[PDB]
Write a protein that binds this ligand. Structure first.
Ligand SMILES: CCCCCCCCCCCCCC(=O)SCCNC(=O)CCNC(=O)[C@H](O)C(C)(C)COP(=O)(O)OP(=O)(O)OC[C@H]1O[C@@H](n2cnc3c(N)ncnc32)[C@H](O)[C@@H]1OP(=O)(O)O
Ligand SMILES: CN(C)Cc1[nH]nc2ccc(-c3ccc(F)cc3OCCc3cccnc3)cc12
Ligand SMILES: [Mg+2]
Length: 411
């Protein structure tokens, strides 16, 4: 059924998945020297291209491909519209590897036809807690602990084939070439997410939305006036009342994050993320890059009490194109990023997130039920959306875990 995925080192079924008791590689080991030094063969009318993220034109080309051809919702009403500044941020973290950004252009005119990107990540991806317990009972503790150490792997994102080239088996060619370029750097695992079901997720979580501007969400048919709001003489005014937020954060002590906060934010984030089975390890440089405020891209606030940062939250912006509304062109969405609470309940920290996002003109706040995102769903009036984000590894056997055991946010 899967002419490409059947050839690859991933669990092939939920059954195979269910028989996995220890983290580790799928494939028997290979070496750098074994990997072909030349790009994968491609049709004589296409050419491989490694964009230069320092070049505005290169970023623009990527931007335009994704604006017109990237992920839509299931009803083709909305398409993600990542900005050029967001793409530069996402694609160029500390020590990124230029060769891991892989594109296909049409030779004649240099039109970008397909793209895939890899970036480095350091991930805790050893045997999960519930499985380590089972192992201790089997006297199988050592094998269970073998791959406990954080690993330097590849995070894959932004796979896109132009609409005119769909269903021509171009996506496998992209994936094979990305795999080659990564393997040539002695990295043999990747992590990726998708909304679609592929062989075979190690975790799956529902996504959620929190209305910040319900009048606009209704206008663009992101939301409806729910049928229960019909019992009301005036459905809409009631809907705004329901989702109203304060003008200003309620935590005194909240301010935007500045560079001098990086060491403290790194400490509190790394301590928190340890509670989770799969999660990134970030250096000070990586904390700086992923969390310092950047206009229109990422927004981060700390709670500082007695000159000590005790809590923080971050969110990032992805606008969506609204396909065909006479009044609005764009949906301005905020997505919950990393956070850590030590002084206050999480619901109280994230209420400030919603307050800031609303003040700054966002229409909706979105998140997947990873981290401890379930703890504030009800009180903060998040609703479950129509699908799931699925988490996957390439070349890593991994037992099924709950999404509330996942601490990697994928952009
Ligand atoms: C160690 C290093 C490893 C590095 C690599 C790690 C793996 C990275 C994996 C990539 C992680 C990406 C993470 C993200 O960025 S997820 C976002 C994916 N992007 C979009 O949804 C944008 C809109 N759609 C498109 O651009 C195209 O429809 C894509 C490119 C998605 C498929 O193009 P097209 O529709 O023209 O089809 P095809 O004829 O070329 O190819 C058909 C084959 O492609 C398999 N397919 C379909 N969708 C996906 C998908 N999202 N992940 C992986 N595989 C996918 C499909 O099952 C089939 O294989 P098989 O079923 O026949 O076997
Ligand atoms: C995470 N990277 C690889 C991007 C990506 N690729 N496939 C994706 C499917 C879902 C989401 C997603 C994630 C978090 C969230 F809070 C809401 C989400 O989707 C709402 C529905 C939607 C989909 C598409 C367009 N508009 C709305 C991201 C996806
Ligand atoms: Mg294709």
């Amino acid at each position: 059924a899967h002419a490409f995925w059947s050839t690859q080192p991933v669990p092939q079924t939920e059954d195979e998945t269910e028989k996995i008791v220890f983290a580790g590689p799928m494939d028997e080991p290979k070496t750098v020297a074994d990997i072909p030094e030349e790009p994968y063969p491609i049709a004589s009318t296409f050419e491989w291209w490694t964009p230069n993220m320092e070049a505005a034109d290169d970023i623009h080309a990527i931007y335009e491909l994704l604006r017109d051809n990237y992920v839509e919702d299931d009803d083709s009403m909305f398409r993600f519209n990542y900005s050029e500044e967001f793409l530069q941020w996402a694609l160029c973290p500390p020590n990124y590897i230029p060769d891991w950004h892989v594109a296909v252009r049409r030779k004649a005119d240099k039109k970008l036809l397909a793209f895939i990107a890899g970036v480095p990540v350091t991930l805790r991806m050893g045997t999960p807690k519930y499985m380590k317990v089972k192992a201790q009972e089997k006297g199988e503790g050592e094998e269970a602990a073998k791959y406990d150490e954080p690993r330097h792997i590849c995070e894959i994102n932004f796979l896109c084939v132009h609409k005119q080239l769909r269903e021509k088996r171009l996506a496998p060619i992209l994936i094979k070439e990305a795999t080659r370029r990564v393997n040539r750097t002695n990295v043999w695992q990747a992590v990726y997410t998708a909304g679609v079901l592929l062989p075979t997720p190690y975790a799956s979580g529902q996504y959620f939305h929190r209305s910040l501007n319900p009048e606009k969400l209704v206008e663009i048919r992101f939301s409806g006036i729910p049928a229960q709001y019909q019992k009301f003489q005036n459905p809409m005014a009631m809907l705004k009342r329901n989702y109203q937020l304060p003008s200003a954060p309620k935590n005194s002590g909240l301010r935007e994050m500045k560079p001098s906060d990086v060491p403290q934010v790194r400490r509190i984030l790394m301590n928190y993320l340890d509670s989770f089975d799969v999660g990134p390890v970030f250096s000070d440089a990586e904390i700086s890059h992923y969390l310092l405020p950047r206009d229109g891209v990422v927004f981060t606030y700390v709670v500082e009490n007695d000159k000590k940062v005790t809590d923080f939250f971050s969110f990032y912006r992805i606008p969506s194109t609204v396909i065909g509304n006479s009044n609005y062109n764009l949906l301005n969405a905020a997505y919950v990023h990393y956070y850590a609470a030590t002084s206050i309940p999480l619901h109280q920290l994230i209420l400030d997130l919603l307050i800031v996002a609303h003040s700054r003109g966002f229409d909706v706040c979105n998140m997947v039920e990873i981290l401890d995102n379930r703890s504030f769903v009800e009180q903060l009036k998040f609703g479950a959306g129509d699908g799931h984000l699925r988490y996957y590894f390439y070349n890593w056997a991994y037992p099924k875990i709950k999404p509330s055991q996942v601490a990697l946010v994928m952009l």
